[PDB]
Amino acid sequence: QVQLKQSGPGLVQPSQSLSITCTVSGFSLTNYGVHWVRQSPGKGLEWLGVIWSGGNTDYNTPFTSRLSINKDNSKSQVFFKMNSLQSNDTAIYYCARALTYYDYEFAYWGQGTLVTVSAASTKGPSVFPLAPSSKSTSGGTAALGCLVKDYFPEPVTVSWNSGALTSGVHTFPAVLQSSGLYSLSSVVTVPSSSLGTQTYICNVNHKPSNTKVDKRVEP
Amino acid sequence: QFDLSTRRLK
Amino acid sequence: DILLTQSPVILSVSPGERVSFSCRASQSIGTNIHWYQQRTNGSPRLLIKYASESISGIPSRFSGSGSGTDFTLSINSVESEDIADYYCQQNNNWPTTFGAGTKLELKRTVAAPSVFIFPPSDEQLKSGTASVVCLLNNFYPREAKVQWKVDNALQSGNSQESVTEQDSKDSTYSLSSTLTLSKADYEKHKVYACEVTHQGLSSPVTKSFNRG
């Protein structure tokens, strides 16, 4: 099928530059233009630019001087680069493809790339168990979780049992602590009778720090 | 306001 | 640039109801408008193109109408999976621009939270910090009160809350309140208590533990 897969999230220092790679499949770059859109708290969805089939680029007016899009057709790659970023450039960046080669109705999107702009430093999280017990048990159902503490920047991905456990999972939005580091918990409810038979593991992945931890959670 | 953590309006 | 104004910002409806989102343009744009859905942690999803034209894979309950400056997206019978934000896009004038979006929230029957409590792990204690987590699971509506008490001393300012987006299946919310102390303070005390108030409870629910 048609897919757009962007490079992972990361930290970029103020005044520095941003680089994202969009790798496409299910179509050729020689036949479709690839667009770049961003989503920020300040301005919501903004169309940034486009590289067309034949290599021509268009940039939205406010970005003409600090934006360049390039591509490798043979590699099916599109490269987004933006200079001199300020903190308000913190946004999710998407590459996208329209229904027809010349149009702008975006039927296909990349998964997005959360870029944080900040002078600070990348820090991986610590993962601690939220162990099930009689105090997290009610009517044959036990709750358990993982505390993902003290990382920067957002985001972290959390799954359970390598993706095989999705039902009853709640991964809370991160909160920013006074330390300027993020923290979240991920929880899941299971039958309490499975606690003695089934292993429960939160798979934590903080891509900006290349930190992957698998945390086993036991009663 | 758009929230980058959840990709949802808050 | 064309300004697209979506109003209201928040819509709250019950399942099975018809619902309409409005998109108004700062000048005529013909029928050059597209609509998008964004679910929690999702990328935008194309629902309608050119005011009214359908899109492959999009449920029939979604439709669109309008021309000129006034446009409408409609869901004839809302489901829980429709919980999302909705955006409009014009492309009659370069550059293509987007509305600020409308949030779609679902009503449902009151559901009291299940309340669970988690002491700090010995693991975390080795690091010199203690987190006590209080979980309020699958409740509606969103409003709730969490009050921490350590040895009958009311805690204030040393906890943080987080609430999930509305569940796309059962329309509920879940909440975590995390109380953070130093290892020393944590060791100086015995009783840790999370007291929960919610519309679905006929009296506050207290979940607590003694350290050890």
Numbering used by the authors:
A (entry chain B): 1 to 219
B (entry chain E): 2 to 11
C (entry chain A): 1 to 212
Copy the relevant paper text.
We have also determined important residues emanating from the Fab through systematically grafting the binding site onto M5A, an anti-CEA mAb. In this report, we investigate the possibility of increasing the affinity of this interaction by reaching through to the other side of the Fab hole. Our recent efforts to characterize and optimize the affinity of the meditope–Fab complex focused on the importance of cyclization and side-chain modifications.
In each case we preserved the original length of the main chain of the n-butyl group (four atoms). The crystal structure indicates that the terminal hydroxyl group forms a hydrogen bond to the Fab.
